[PDB]
Design an enzyme around this catalytic site. Structure first.
Site, mmCIF file in Angstrom:
data_model
loop_
_atom_site.group_PDB
_atom_site.id
_atom_site.type_symbol
_atom_site.label_atom_id
_atom_site.label_comp_id
_atom_site.label_asym_id
_atom_site.label_seq_id
_atom_site.Cartn_x
_atom_site.Cartn_y
_atom_site.Cartn_z
ATOM 1 N N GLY A 17 0.747 -1.193 -0.074
ATOM 2 C CA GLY A 17 -0.070 -0.005 -0.090
ATOM 3 C C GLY A 17 0.796 1.242 -0.105
ATOM 4 O O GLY A 17 2.076 1.221 0.142
ATOM 5 N N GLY A 19 0.760 5.025 1.938
ATOM 6 C CA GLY A 19 -0.121 6.124 3.065
ATOM 7 C C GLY A 19 0.283 7.625 2.619
ATOM 8 O O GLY A 19 0.295 7.982 1.378
ATOM 9 N N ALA A 20 0.241 8.473 3.374
ATOM 10 C CA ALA A 20 0.287 9.805 3.142
ATOM 11 C C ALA A 20 1.642 10.240 2.287
ATOM 12 O O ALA A 20 1.719 11.136 1.472
ATOM 13 C CB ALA A 20 0.500 10.746 4.360
ATOM 14 N N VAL A 23 6.014 4.385 0.189
ATOM 15 C CA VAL A 23 5.392 3.024 -0.539
ATOM 16 C C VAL A 23 5.701 1.928 0.065
ATOM 17 O O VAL A 23 6.986 1.763 0.652
ATOM 18 C CB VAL A 23 5.490 2.721 -1.940
ATOM 19 C CG1 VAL A 23 6.896 2.713 -2.567
ATOM 20 C CG2 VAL A 23 4.634 1.525 -2.536
ATOM 21 N N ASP A 130 -4.600 9.487 15.562
ATOM 22 C CA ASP A 130 -5.074 8.722 14.374
ATOM 23 C C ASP A 130 -5.316 7.140 14.755
ATOM 24 O O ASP A 130 -5.438 6.446 13.845
ATOM 25 C CB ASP A 130 -4.296 8.984 13.034
ATOM 26 C CG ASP A 130 -5.419 8.757 11.722
ATOM 27 O OD1 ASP A 130 -6.652 8.696 12.012
ATOM 28 O OD2 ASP A 130 -4.835 8.569 10.587
#
Ligand SMILES: CC(C)(C)c1c/c(=N\C(=O)Nc2ccc(Oc3cccnc3)cc2)n(-c2cccc(F)c2)[nH]1
Length: 293
Positions: A17, A19-20, A23, A130
């Site tokens: 995946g 994220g912000a 990779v 978060d």
């Protein structure tokens, strides 16, 4: 102390995946299944360094383990959670596993142990900000929870955070209270609202909370509702949540049992702001009665 790893020693497999920034791919290193976080643009260098300094400052059984890091090129080496995220376990693709009240309660205790540790950080407390099931990974046959941060969060956000207010580590407590409701009911919080995220923010800011759980023990109900109080100062600290959750585990045997049974899923829409738990509390009541009653 940071374990230096040479990039040639890593066998990078498939992408997991994004994220912000960076990779995340699956990789091999020292005859082991590992996770690698690598840079894609020279822009995200500063952000990698921040992650690397924070991940290497933290050491607790319920926080994702950093193995080491590459310097040329910048890359983070992590433990791999084959069990995937908690969100995937709860609401992911079929076949979803069966889990018990003991699993639900254990996951939440482990999350509080990890967050209490973050809150005790010296010289400054580490606020997760978060806390949500996509940010929680499971290992050891889905019995051991590991807190991560991958960089939509509305459903788990404390209202003071989204209202702009100068918040505290009590925002995580609010988030924990929502996750507790989520593991018990096996429902996505505020899923019925839908639309864009500001609709969730609007409801929560106006006082809206997840529906009440039918037959939920009073000691658990009381803890859950204090956690999601409007006034952050009315929420218990994570140390208190750890203490209460540890005491309640006495009535939740079987948390070390691996997830190995397939579940068939049916979610009926709850009416009059009341829902059924996914987990069964009959054993809790029986064990509580032997001690009390
Ligand atoms: C210590 C806390 C507060 C929980 C924290 C964790 C963190 N980053 C990560 O957890 N990163 C990470 C975690 C797991 C990972 O690999 C995976 C993938 C999916 C499954 N298994 C392993 C790849 C990266 N943090 C982080 C993230 C971005 C920037 C920053 F400064 C800190 N902060």
């Amino acid at each position: 102390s940071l374990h230096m790893i040479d990039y040639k020693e890593i066998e990078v497999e498939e992408v997991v995946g994004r994220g912000a920034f960076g990779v995340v791919c699956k990789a091999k290193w020292r005859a082991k299944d590992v996770a690698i976080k690598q840079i894609e643009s020279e822009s995200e260098r500063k952000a990698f360094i921040v992650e690397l300094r924070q991940l290497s400052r933290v050491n607790h059984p319920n926080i994702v383990k950093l193995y080491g890091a590459c310097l040329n090129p910048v890359c983070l080496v992590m433990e791999y959670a084959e069990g995937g995220s908690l969100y995937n376990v709860l609401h992911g693709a079929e076949p979803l596993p069966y889990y018990t009240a003991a699993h639900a309660m254990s996951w939440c205790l482990q999350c509080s142990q990890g967050v209490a540790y973050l809150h005790s950080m010296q010289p400054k407390a580490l606020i997760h900000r978060d806390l949500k099931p996509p940010n929680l990974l499971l290992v050891a046959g889905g019995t051991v929870l590991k807190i991560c941060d991958f960089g939509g969060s509305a459903a788990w956000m404390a209202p003071e955070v989204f209202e702009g207010s100068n918040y505290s580590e009590k925002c995580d407590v609010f988030s924990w209270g929502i996750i507790l409701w989520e593991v018990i009911t096996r429902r996505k919080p505020f899923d019925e609202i839908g639309g864009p995220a500001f609709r969730i923010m609007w409801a929560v800011h106006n006082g809206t909370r997840p529906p009440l759980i039918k037959n939920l023990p009073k000691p658990i109900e009381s803890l859950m509702t204090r956690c999601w109080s409007k006034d952050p100062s009315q929420r218990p600290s994570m140390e208190e949540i750890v203490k209460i959750m540890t005491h309640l585990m006495r009535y939740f045997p079987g948390a070390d049992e691996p997830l190995q049974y397939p579940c068939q899923h049916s979610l009926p829409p709850g009416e009059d702001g009341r829902v059924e738990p996914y987990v069964d509390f009959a054993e809790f009541y029986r064990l509580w009665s032997v001690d009390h009653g």
